[PDB]
Amino acid sequence: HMEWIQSLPKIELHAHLNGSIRDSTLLELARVLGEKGVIVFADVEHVIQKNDRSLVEVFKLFDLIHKLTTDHKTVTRITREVVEDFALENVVYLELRTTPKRSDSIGMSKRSYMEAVIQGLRSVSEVDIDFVTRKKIYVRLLLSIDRRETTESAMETVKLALEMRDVGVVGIDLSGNPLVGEWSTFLPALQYAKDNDLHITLHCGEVPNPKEIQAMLDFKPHRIGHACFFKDEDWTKLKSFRIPVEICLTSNIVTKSISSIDIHHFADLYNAKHPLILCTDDFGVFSTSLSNEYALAVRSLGLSKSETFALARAAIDATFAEDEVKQQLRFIFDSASPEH
Numbered sequence: 001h002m003e004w005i006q007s008l009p010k011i012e013l014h015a016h017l018n019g020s021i022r023d024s025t026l027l028e029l030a031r032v033l034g035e036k037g038v039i040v041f042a043d044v045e046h047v048i049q050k051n052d053r054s055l056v057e058v059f060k061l062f063d064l065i066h067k068l069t070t071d072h073k074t075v076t077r078i079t080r081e082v083v084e085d086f087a088l089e090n091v092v093y094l095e096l097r098t099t100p101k102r103s104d105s106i107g108m109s110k111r112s113y114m115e116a117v118i119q120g121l122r123s124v125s126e127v128d129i130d131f132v133t134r135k136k137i138y139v140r141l142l143l144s145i146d147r148r149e150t151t152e153s154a155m156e157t158v159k160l161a162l163e164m165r166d167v168g169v170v171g172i173d174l175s176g177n178p179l180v181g182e183w184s185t186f187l188p189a190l191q192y193a194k195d196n197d198l199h200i201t202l203h204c205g206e207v208p209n210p211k212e213i214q215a216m217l218d219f220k221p222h223r224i225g226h227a228c229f230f231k232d233e234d235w236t237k238l239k240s241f242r243i244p245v246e247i248c249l250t251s252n253i254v255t256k257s258i259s260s261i262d263i264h265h266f267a268d269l270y271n272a273k274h275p276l277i278l279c280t281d282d283f284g285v286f287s288t289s290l291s292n293e294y295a296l297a298v299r300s301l302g303l304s305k306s307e308t309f310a311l312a313r314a315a316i317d318a319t320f321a322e323d324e325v326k327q328q329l330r331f332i333f334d335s336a337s338p339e340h
């Protein structure tokens with residue numbers, strides 16, 4: 001069964017760039033930076049292997065990753081590697097999200113960080129890529145606002161995303177530590193993005209926060225991530241607004257946001273015929289792949305091949321891609337439909 005899942009064409013809508021790095025690359029970068037003295041390799045490798053990746057604790061790990069990866073040449077490298085890995089497991093469409101970074105000591109701006117991501121996409125050679133406007137993969141980009149940021153800084157990210165629509169930026173994400181920051185800080189920037197026809201996805205309900213969950217739903221983003229701590233009134237509103245949910249099974253269970261796959265809300269959403277999309281979140285941090293996520297879901301719901309194929313194909317109308325791309329995806333899935 002895992003073989004048929006691996007060959008299934010798949011759509012990834014929730015994958016953070018610096019959460020998707022290969023272990024071998026992360027440790028290579030750790031070794032190099034150690035031998036330069038920027039850090040102590042044994043300690044860094046130890047936080048890499050020891051971190052329990054509970055929620056509070058995952059964000060410590062990201063602060064460490066960012067010390068290893070915030071340089072233009074590294075951004076380019078990991079962008080290429082992430083696209084390759086997804087393409088190799090037959091992801092045919094990827095929305096990759098990343099937080100653009102500022103770092104004055106190396107002359108890195110949010111814009112130059114993103115230019116390094118584009119360079120990564122241009123450097124992809126193992127597979128064919130469409131990112132502007134042999135496996136082939138369509139890639140489009142989401143710029144993330146981190147909940148640590150100010151309204152002004154969030155607006156800088158939205159302005160950059162509008163400038164980069166010609167190289168495949170299609171939307172904005174709100175992510176980062178859900179215990180930090182206030183919705184009122186980010187709402188004005190997200191509203192500007194939405195009024196400029198960017199699509200919006202929000203990390204929503206990663207921790208209990210009833211007023212924030214309601215405010216995010218009332219904003220009517222185009223998708224939401226996770227929804228782990230929704231209450232009944234939140235589900236009612238979500239189902240009537242028809243906002244698709246990006247479901248991250250391994251991430252949710254590992255962080256203990258959801259106590260087990262047998263109670264995970266994706267089963268309720270599936271049976272309610274509410275749109276959901278299986279995603280990896282951070283396949284490096286959480287040691288998974290999109291195929292493995294599909295395998296967990298197929299086992300837990302007991303889906304047949306055709307039900308699984310139908311679920312995978314349903315994600316097309318949740319993408320933020322232009323209509324021409326969705327028609328190509330419909331052709332890719334229609335072409336694969338009888339083998340499933």
Ligand SMILES: O=c1[nH]cnc2c1ncn2[C@@H]1O[C@H](COP(=O)(O)O)[C@@H](O)[C@H]1O
Nearest residue numbers: 016017018019062098099144175176282
């Ligand atoms: O579980 C999650 N919840 C909220 N934010 C996350 C999660 N996983 C990754 N991220 C965000 O994604 C970033 C890592 O990818 P980056 O944006 O490419 O730097 C982190 O610094 C977080 O802000």
Ligand SMILES: [Zn+2]
Nearest residue numbers: 016175225281
């Ligand atoms: Zn996420």
